[PDB]
Amino acid sequence: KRLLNTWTNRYPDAKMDPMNIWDDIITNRCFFLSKIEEKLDISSLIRSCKFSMKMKMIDSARKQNNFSLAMKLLKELHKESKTRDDWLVSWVQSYCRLSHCRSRSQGCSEQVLTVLKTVSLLDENNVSSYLSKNILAFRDQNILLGTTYRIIANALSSEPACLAEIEEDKARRILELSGEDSEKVIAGLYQRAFQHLSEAVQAAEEEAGVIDAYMTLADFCDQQLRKEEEAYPALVVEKMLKALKLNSNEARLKFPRLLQIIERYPEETLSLMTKEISSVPCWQFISWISHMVALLDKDQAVAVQHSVEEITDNYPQAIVYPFIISSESTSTGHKNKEFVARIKSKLDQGGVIQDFINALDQLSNPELLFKDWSNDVRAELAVNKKNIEKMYERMYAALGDPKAPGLGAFRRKFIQTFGKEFDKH
Question: Is 412 helix (H, G, I), strand (E, B) or coil?
Fold first, then answer.
């Protein structure tokens, strides 16, 4: 039982099922523990069980956004936290996660009033129990540290005249200590938060929270870039790339940001596009196939065209059509032409798809194309009789010719009945 009772008797609907039911359950649990012990180390066991259920309680209520927590029970666990270092630091982490959650709308001033609750509750009391505990809690503490530092820096940047900033207190000095100058303070805060995020990343990589650290650092760097516009880029994009290696939907969604940062700073991404097969071989970006097949005509990251080449090898389908639409449209652009030549060679009897599309097109009303081209002739008219002749040949092969593939009859006879129409004028 002292095992089954664990996990609030198997989480009775965590993150849902309002705390009322949870409160009833925990009341039952503690009552049963009292009954059992009173009729009987073991007391320490049941007290640890109570610790566990109540921390699950507070975690869930925070997850249910019930900022009206068991604040009093939170403080009860606070007093009882000192009973042992592990339970103490677990309470500390719960409180800090609450406070970060408590940063809701007035997070700036209210969080400054309680800067990481005296910052990591002065975790120097025992840092991961002097690291004698796991690196798990260790990187969690680093996450909290960087999180609060980032929150404060964003608060100061958004509000450079906060009332708590106006409030002259001890919080000022540590503000400059962890940060002097307001811009200098926020720069130092961002630097320290980045340091803590890096610590959390490296701790996670020792053995998923690793992906979580990657995503947090990606958010950090994206903020850096956004504020640097209206150092970081290399390592941050490589880290989020290693994250997407551990395939994740959001890690997928960071792909267009990767493209943008490659465009803005191709320098380091050149060293980083080197690791694109070696960084992630997972066959993805099918939802992004447009993004690099348009890039196929460019050389911004040749390893991306190698990636899509490998995809086409694995997947001779679903790439042929983006490849065609890209081919519809130097010292290295010749390499792009080599790329497209290689891909079209890799098209297994691409004439299959070509004749298929032609068969589709025989259904289309050619007068539509003729009208669009009657517009195109004036689009070119305002260059003339050199591209006008090119489309003249295009419109010909469409209708001026009397013969065409496809075993249709309607258009297959209109081509031959109006090639004269096309040629006479």
Answer: helix
Report the distance separating Cα 392 and Cα 399, nearest Å.
10
Distance of alpha carbon 129 from alpha carbon 259, whole angstroms: 42
For residues 257, 261, 263, 264, the Cα torsion angle rounded to the nearest 10 degrees is 140
Give the CA distances from residue 38 to residues 4, 30, 35, 110, in Å, rounded to whole numbers and listed in that order.
20, 12, 5, 44
The residue among 250, 268, 246 whose CA lies nearest residue 201 is: 246
Expt. technique: cryo-EM
Closest CA to 310 of 283, 347, 272, 348: 283
Classify the phi-psi angles of 336: left when phi > 0, otherwise alpha if psi is within -120 to 50, otherwise beta. Answer: alpha
Contact 145, 185 (CB under 8 A): no
CA pair distance 24, 40, nearest whole angstrom: 24
Alpha helix ranges (H) inside 103-181: 107-113, 118-122, 135-158, 163-166, 170-178
Rg of the chain over all Cα atoms, to the nearest angstrom:
32
Q: How far is CA 116 from the centre of its chain?
A: 26
